[PDB]
Structures are given as C-alpha cells and as structure tokens.
Structure 1
Amino acid sequence: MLTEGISIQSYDGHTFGALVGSPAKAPAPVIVIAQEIFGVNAFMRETVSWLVDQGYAAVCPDLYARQAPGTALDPQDERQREQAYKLWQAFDMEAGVGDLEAAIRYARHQPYSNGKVGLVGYSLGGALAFLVAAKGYVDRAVGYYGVGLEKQLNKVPEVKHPALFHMGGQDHFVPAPSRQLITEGFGANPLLQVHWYEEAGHSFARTSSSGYVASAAALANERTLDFLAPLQS
C-alpha cells in the first residue's frame, strides 16, 4: 500500500510513490524506511505505525517502482516469495540508493519536518542503509540484517555520519568468516555501530517471519529508538 497522490522524482526522472505517515505532533524528524524484498507491504505499514507512535514522521518509498510499481507481497505466500526473489535478483542497487536520496530530500522539506532525517532499512534496505551512510545523505542510518555487507568494506572510511547495524548470529547469509570481516572492518570507524544477536537469523524483527525472535527484536528496536532520539528537536 502507498499514500494516494504522493509522487517523488529521482535523479533520472523516474518517479515513484510512497507510504507516508505524518507525525502525532509537528515539527518532527522524518524517517525514510528502506523496504525488505517484499515491496511496501504489511511490515512496512507496521514500521510506519511504530515510528509515528514514537514521535517521528515516516516515508516508505516504492523502491520496486522501476520494475513493477505498487508491488506489496505477502512473505507467507510461496508464489509471492518467488516473485520477491525475482525482483530482488533484478534490483539495481545504485538506482535504489538514488531513489532513497530523492526520498530523503523529499523528507527534509515536508511541512511537518524539523529538518532532520533518518533512515531505517531491513534486508535489502539494510544493505541500502550502509550505501546511503557511505554517501552521507542522512543524519543517522540504521540497518537490520543487510545482506552482503562484507563486500562493501572498502566504503567504511567514507561514513561521515552515525550508522547502526543489527546483525543476526544465526543468519546464514553471513557465515563465520563474513562476520569477522564485517566486525573488524566496521570497527575501524567509530561512527559505525554493529550489534550481533546470537540466537537470531535474518528477519528477526518481523513478527510474520519464521525467524522472528522477540528478545532480539525488542533489544534491537530499543537501540534503534535510542539511536534516532537525538534527531527529535
């Protein structure tokens, strides 16, 4: 689901829609939420609701609009998971970073904005949160279980603003040598914070996942909110 009539223009003219949640009380910082591989679906709506309940505004851009606008997939339906994997495989990461930059710009100038913008991503969005952090487009970035971060370690010194990452210890997208490479490499830049959750894999913060872990989801979530709180005016 997306908010009817919201259209944001990216760097190459491609346009995309977004799910927007205005804040309980304005002015407030705006959080751009970077989706998993399922489009702007139930978990994105729940994440918008959560951040609004915590005093933020939120904007979740339709990142699959370059391939299929308005895609919103149920991660519990096998056929939809299959479509999600095909969209992820064809996803242009560089164009995704550009769409996020355009949504972050849109976020800064909304009537209810206090001028500070944060980004929270999960999954594809967690990998995107690291690329956005290396670019410096936001005041603070958060990534949950981003895939393939071990292949982007050369971007670690480009990070000039705080960025926080929650990684699962039983996430098999990140085997033991990849965890060591990420821990050592991120550890060279104090603006990067990474936490490992020993008993959790990916998607541990999503209640609909077979990988949901309540204790890990709650500790990561409170860390995320403590980390975003300095953006509140």
Structure 2
Amino acid sequence: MLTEGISIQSYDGHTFGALVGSPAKAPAPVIVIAQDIFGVNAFMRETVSWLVDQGYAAVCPDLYARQAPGTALDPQDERQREQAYKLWQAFDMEAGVGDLEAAIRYARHQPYSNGKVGLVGYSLGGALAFLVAAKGYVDRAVGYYGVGLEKQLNKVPEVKHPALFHMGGQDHFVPAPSRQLITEGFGANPLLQVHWYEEAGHSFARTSSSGYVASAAALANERTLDFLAPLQS
C-alpha cells in the first residue's frame, strides 16, 4: 500500500510512490524506511506506525517500482515469497541507493520536516542502509539484518555519519566467518556500530515472521530509537 498522490523523482528521472506517515506534532525528523524483499507491505505500514508513535514522520519508498510498481507481498503466502525472491534477484542495488537518495532529499523538505533525516532498512533495506551510509546521504542510518555486508567492507572508511546494524547470531545469511569479517571490518570505524543478537536469525524484528524473537526485537528497536533520538528537535 502506498499513499496516493505521493511521487518522488530519482536523479535518472524515474518516479516512484511511497507510503508516508506525517508526524503527530510537526516539525519532526523524517525517517526513510528501506523495505525488505516483500515491497511496501503490512510490515512497512507497521514500521511507519511504530515510528510515528515515537515522534517521527516516515517515508517508505516503492523501491520495486523500476520492476513492478506497487508490489506488496504477503510473506506467509508461498507463491508471493517466490515472487519476492525473483524481484530481489533482479533488483538493481545501485538504482535502489539512488531512489533512497531521492526519498531522503524529499524527506528533508516536506511541510512536517525538521530538516533532519534518518534511514532504517530491513534485510534488502539493511544492505541498502549500509550503502547509503557509505555515500553519506543521511544524518543516521540503521540496518536490520542486511545481507552480504561482508562483501562491502571496502566501503567502511567511506562512512562519515553514524550507522547502526542489528544482526542475528543465527541468521544463516551470515555464517561465522562472514560475521567475523564484518565485526573486524566495521570495528575500524567508530561511526559504525554492529550488535549481534545471539538467539535470533533473519527477520527477528517482524512479529509476523517465524523468526520473530521478541527480546531481540525489543532490544534492537530501543537501540534504534535511542540512536535516532538526536535527530529530534
């Protein structure tokens, strides 16, 4: 689901929609939410709700609009999971960073904006959060269980603004040697923080997932909120 009428334009000209949640009290810092591989779906609506309840505004851009605008897939439906994997495999990561950069610019100047912008991404969006952090587009970035971060470690020195990552100790997208690579690599730049949740795997913060772990979700979420709080007026 997207907010009707909302359109954002990327540097290359491509336009896309977004789900927007204005803040309870304005002005407020705006958080761009980078989707998981299921599009802008119920979990995105829940994340927008969560952030608005904590004093933020939120913008979740339709990152699958270069392939299939308006995709919103139910992760409990097997055929829709297959569609999500096919869309993820075809997803252009650099174009996704570009679309997030455009949503970040859009977030800086809405009527409800206080001019500060944070980014929170999950899974696919957690990998995008690290790439956006390396570009320096936002004041603060957060990634939950991004995949493939051990292949992007050369960008660690490029991060010049804070970025926080929550990783599952049982997420097998990140086996032990990849965890060690990330830990050591991210360890070189104090603007990066990575926490490991030993009893959790992928998708541990989505209540709807078979991998939900409430204690890890709660700890990571309060760390996310404490990390974004300086963006507030």
Describe the superposition over 1:25-77 as per-residue Cα deviations: whole angstroms up to 9, x where unpaired.
Answer: 00000000000000000000000000000000000000000000000000000
1:228 matches 2:228: yes
Describe the superposition over 1:126-162 as per-residue Cα deviations: whole angstroms up to 9, x where unpaired.
Answer: 0000000000000000000000000000000000000
Which secondary structure does the structure 2 equivalent of 1:33 belong to? strand
Shift of 1:210: 0.5
Distance 1:202 1:134 in 2: 23
Distance 1:211 1:177 in 2: 22
Shift of 1:208: 0.7
Distance 1:212 1:27 in 2: 33
Which secondary structure does the structure 1 equivalent of 2:118 belong to? strand
Distance 2:176 2:164 in 1: 20
Describe the superposition over 1:92-132 as per-residue Cα deviations: whole angstroms up to 9, x where unpaired.
Answer: 00000000000000000101101000000000000000000
Describe the superposition over 1:1-26 as per-residue Cα deviations: whole angstroms up to 9, x where unpaired.
Answer: 00000000101111000000000000
Identity value in percent: 100
Describe the superposition over 1:140-198 as per-residue Cα deviations: whole angstroms up to 9, x where unpaired.
Answer: 00000000000000000000000000000000000000000000000000000000000
Distance 2:12 2:106 in 1: 16
Distance 1:188 1:37 in 2: 30
> Any stretches of 5+ residues in structure 2 without a counterpart?
none
Distance 1:212 1:223 in 2: 17
Shift of 1:232: 0.1
Distance 1:114 1:5 in 2: 22
Distance 1:166 1:23 in 2: 25
Distance 1:70 1:27 in 2: 29
Give the TM-score of the pair, scaled to structure 2.
1.00
Shift of 1:206: 0.2
Which secondary structure does the structure 1 equivalent of 2:4 belong to? coil
Distance 1:113 1:198 in 2: 37
Give the TM-score of the pair, scaled to structure 1.
1.00
Shift of 1:223: 0.2
Distance 1:83 1:11 in 2: 28
Distance 2:176 2:58 in 1: 35
Which secondary structure does the structure 1 equivalent of 2:29 belong to? strand
1:197 matches 2:197: yes
Structure 1 segments of 4+ aligned residues over 4 angstroms from their partners: none
Q: What is the count of residue pairs matched by the alignment?
A: 233
